[PDB]
Symmetry: D2
Subunit: 359 residues, 4 copies
Amino acid sequence: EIPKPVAPAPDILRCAYAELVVTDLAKSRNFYVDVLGLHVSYEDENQIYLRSFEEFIHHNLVLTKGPVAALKAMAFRVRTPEDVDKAEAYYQELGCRTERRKDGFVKGIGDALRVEDPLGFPYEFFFETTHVERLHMRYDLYSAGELVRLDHFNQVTPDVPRGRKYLEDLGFRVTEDIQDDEGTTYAAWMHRKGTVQDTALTGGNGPRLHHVAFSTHEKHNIIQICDKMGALRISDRIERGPGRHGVSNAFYLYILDPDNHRIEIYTQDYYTGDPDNPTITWNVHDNQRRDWWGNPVVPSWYTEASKVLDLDGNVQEIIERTDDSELEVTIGADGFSFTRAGDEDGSYHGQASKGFKLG
Amino acid sequence: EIPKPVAPAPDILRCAYAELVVTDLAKSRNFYVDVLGLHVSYEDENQIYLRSFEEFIHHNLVLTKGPVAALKAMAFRVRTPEDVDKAEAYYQELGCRTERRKDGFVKGIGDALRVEDPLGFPYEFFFETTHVERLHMRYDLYSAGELVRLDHFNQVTPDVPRGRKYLEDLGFRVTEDIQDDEGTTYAAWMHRKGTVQDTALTGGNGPRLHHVAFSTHEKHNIIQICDKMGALRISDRIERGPGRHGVSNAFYLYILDPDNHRIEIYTQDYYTGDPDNPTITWNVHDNQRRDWWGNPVVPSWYTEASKVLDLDGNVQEIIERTDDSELEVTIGADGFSFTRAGDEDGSYHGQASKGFKLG
Amino acid sequence: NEIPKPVAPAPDILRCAYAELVVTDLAKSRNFYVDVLGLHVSYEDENQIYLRSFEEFIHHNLVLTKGPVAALKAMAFRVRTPEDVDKAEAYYQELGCRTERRKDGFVKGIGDALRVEDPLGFPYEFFFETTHVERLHMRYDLYSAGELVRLDHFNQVTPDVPRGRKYLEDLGFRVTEDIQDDEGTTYAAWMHRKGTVQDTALTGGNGPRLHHVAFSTHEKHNIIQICDKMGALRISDRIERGPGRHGVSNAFYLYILDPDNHRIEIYTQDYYTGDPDNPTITWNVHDNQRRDWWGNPVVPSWYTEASKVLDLDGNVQEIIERTDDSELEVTIGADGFSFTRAGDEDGSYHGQASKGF
Amino acid sequence: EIPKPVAPAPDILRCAYAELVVTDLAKSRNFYVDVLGLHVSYEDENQIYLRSFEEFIHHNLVLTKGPVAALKAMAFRVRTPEDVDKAEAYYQELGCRTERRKDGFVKGIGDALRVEDPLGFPYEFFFETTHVERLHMRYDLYSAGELVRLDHFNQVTPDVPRGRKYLEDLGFRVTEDIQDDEGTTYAAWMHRKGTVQDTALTGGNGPRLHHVAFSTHEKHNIIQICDKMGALRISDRIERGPGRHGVSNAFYLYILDPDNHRIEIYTQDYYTGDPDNPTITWNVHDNQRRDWWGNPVVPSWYTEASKVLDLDGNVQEIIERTDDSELEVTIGADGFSFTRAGDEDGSYHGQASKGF
Ligand SMILES: O=C(O)Cc1ccc(O)c(O)c1
Ligand SMILES: [Cl-]
Ligand SMILES: [Cl-]
Ligand SMILES: [Cl-]
Ligand SMILES: [Fe+2]
Ligand SMILES: [Fe+2]
Ligand SMILES: [Fe+2]
Ligand SMILES: [Fe+2]
């Protein structure tokens, strides 16, 4: 178990941006800008800085050219400059490596702390950031698939309860989780800002980055992204969806960028800002938990995820999950799922829902 | 091959209603009225007569209690009373069994002709029908999932070109089809009213009824039907979708009623009323032809369909397809499909798209 | 002064197909129709721009032609066969109308075509032949948040609606809806060939003038987006009326004004009319939900302003003043009234418009 | 000018519920339940307790039968039970009348503090509330017009700067406001939860309640409310909209309940939770500020608002605004508004936009 520090946790506002290493910067630009419509705050021959339609901080996404595609940092904004100091003392007390840069790691961020966190993830904490034009009423720019906010990160980690306790100490409250009746936790969702999630843990070998999620205003905006990817004849880069989640109640889609980094598009989850917000626990065998309509979860969604880097820029070594696998217990050869608890009718044994089996 | 009669074809306006035999009238009522929100025009202990939100003819769907669930009639409205006489002479010249009732077969229809058509389907032709309150502005009744129109039927038949030619003689024009490079036809769509289809042919053992389709105004209406089925914990009755079609360009969903009759929900196809409306032919191996986003077609969609009755109410015998199977050539162990024609990247061999094989 | 039915058979008309609008500044008009509204270019040069909607396969739905005086130059209907163009010629000749036949068309991408000065003074075109183009209906890589997907209809201002209505009925248009009063005045009527509420429509007033051209969207949010865009471009003064729900037609709608004040309607989700006994809906002129279903007031400019039309020489047609009662005056003028519920003074408006104006 | 207390402000989470006095409980039930589809948490012969689709606290709206239709309490939830203590100390230091009930003023709320605030409004602060079934996935109940959350209140008050400074001391941050070039403020919007507003101040004679606002998921849900009210032949109870706001960027509608209490339906404003969220100031003469599409604001929107009660249940006396009137300076006989700043084309003199 990760001890609760004596030092006070930084006051975290929200997820703010990710830095992703990409191998071909031009190909990645074509995906994020030409296909998805994100707005360029800055670019040069090595990096592209991108923001969503309603953002006023400098960026929500930094694409950095490098030899090995990976998550370089997942960044959280904190409430005050002094919270960056608090972060540094907190992670030092945890025994983690930290690096402080008074003028930032990436353009448009000021004083910043990066840490190798206890789960092996590269977190950044910052307050200072260069404000840019907020494009929230620039309907002359608005795309039929417009990405309006950054919503969350999702992390793959082998021991979910261990990670959960550490994030709870850091001030994230769990909104929903998936468990079974044998004491195993498969996933958890946790928040600072008043939505379902700012980050989330998915059980599996890690550290790896499962996805970054962006919001739209409406469900039809997500449908348009699918439609556009069909017209561009890149429907093979639609991994999963579109769907309605059980967990979060959001409408959703998962797509894959040119380095296989997974992006979720997401809308219309609910308010979580009250401190006694009810925590929802789903059973891992409930076939409406991930897709509410019962559509099967593709196996790649469980097995594939991005590398993450350490502070030197080297890939973090992967630690194998020993807890039960969600894939195996639901859609694998000895798996089980139900539509109605206690009913054999609409249940699935050793295969996925809707007439499919594992490839 | 079905010869063209000398007698003129009746002038067909549109598909108008289907009569489905159901085994448990109360459970069927719960599905069509309580789940899907169709409007009752008449009911008694034997039958429920239902209509869509914008309809002014007496009904779009008759549910008739019977021992064996089946299609009893697919009815098309003709332009004038005299067109019922034309239909009778047309089908007599084809050598088909016909039955004429001056006062109709079901309530709210007058002079009507039922036929066992050359493909073994029970067709009705009628002009006269009792008008009802057109509910198109009754927003006090409007559901989040409102079904606004009857759109089309879809028929399973073993020899698609033979059926196509017969329907062309009857004045239906082909809008889209699915073929391979070796001259096999797997499916055809054809219309009288100015939309993609009034009926459609799916290659398979037949005669069987594949589906009846209803329209909504908007895509979110279809999403709501899925969401409601999740809330009612009957997501196992969502067969396939929601999706975007390639063929037709319509947003879609397939669900299964209590007797396994398949219902499609459908919106936003295109205008076909010009006589040189361009036909569109898709290759059977194009993985965007049925779901534009490349989501896999569930095998039940290819194999399962409803029995049809003859004019005495007995089940029509099935005649096996000998042309190639769309299921087998796309998703079976020897099948394949592509995302981009000629590209191995995004192609699937011996399994379906997105990482599944057949259950 | 009835327009007598010809003995010659009517051409078989499929639908409204395109309008040719004369515009005074081509570049400004191009800005509006292409950059603001997102219509697709089928051809352009220094004198004309040819534009189509997202789902169209014929060459165009709108031609913008540079000229000295902004006006409707032609409203074009597609007919079912080449022989229908001959039928149109014989029909209008019997009506005593001026006609002009060009075997190779009046505009690019149309072939054999007849233009006529019709009995109501409007320049109608009938054609079959048209160059097919790429149908963009699945080009979601081009699709705009405000995408205009079909041409839907025209609306014509004319002084005597019954006279025009019977003429259009003889030509095969069927009336789907109208607005009347108890004293027997007709204020407006809507009529169709294709299976929607309208291909053209008559608005009572001084005419001939073109009231608007209407394009469809897929969904209501597409119309909202057009409004939002116009706010961002700081041209919200060119939003004339709406967005709303129509009473007549039940469609979601918006009216906007191009740089020459040609009015364009955006329209979605009316109903099917293809059955020959489609029930005809009559509204009372004093029903305040007949035009906007939510009872929002109709601005006076909607009733009084409309585009000039040209004769076949390119000269503006002289205007004939309506003598029948004016819808504006009987509903929102000094002696007008409307109601929310018939016979109920609560929610009625007298000598003014709804909502407090 | 209202002084900043030495005592710490309570930590306010969000607007949580309003108590409205209504004169005919059955007619108000028909409006809020049958027309608008709100969910009944509890009802008896004197009160109806209603909640939105996604709520888990006991209610968002209490309709209380009484002789004079009015706002009885606007309630905000606080982070902890101790924040109710802090609220009491805070308001006592301001010299405000307070009343504290350990078992609540209405069903489903526990220990609660009501105050007559410095602007004459009845505020409630509470933490404890009875949790109920959160209906957020009950799509078997979901209406085409579904109201999914309580969003905000809007208060009419004569001196906006005075009220603004007080709410800021209380921890509300201003997100947007409307001013002119003569130094007058006409309105301000301010928040605790990460949306544009939890309450808002509209310059005018006050204290009065301008509206209570509920959210939908999508714009079509707001359109459906309009369509339904047309079908019910109660379109005369649509006051203004639907529209897109300038201020807030939300899609909106204003309708009137049986006692003329104004309800806004609202969707798709933006995130404000960062402490340096940029404040946006509109000019009062900008004809896109309230309706982005330039549609005219009906005079009744500026002049009509609900009475509010004091802690004894008596109507609060109204104090006259002496600052310039938004109505008069934009749409009155000497009013002015513009589409484009500095452009005479698309400007309006002595009248409202669009031709009225
Ligand atoms: O004015 C109204 O609102 C009625 C009406 C209905 C349909 C239309 O297309 C139109 O232009 C006008
Ligand atoms: Cl999921
Ligand atoms: Cl299909
Ligand atoms: Cl406003
Ligand atoms: Fe996620
Ligand atoms: Fe179909
Ligand atoms: Fe129109
Ligand atoms: Fe408001």
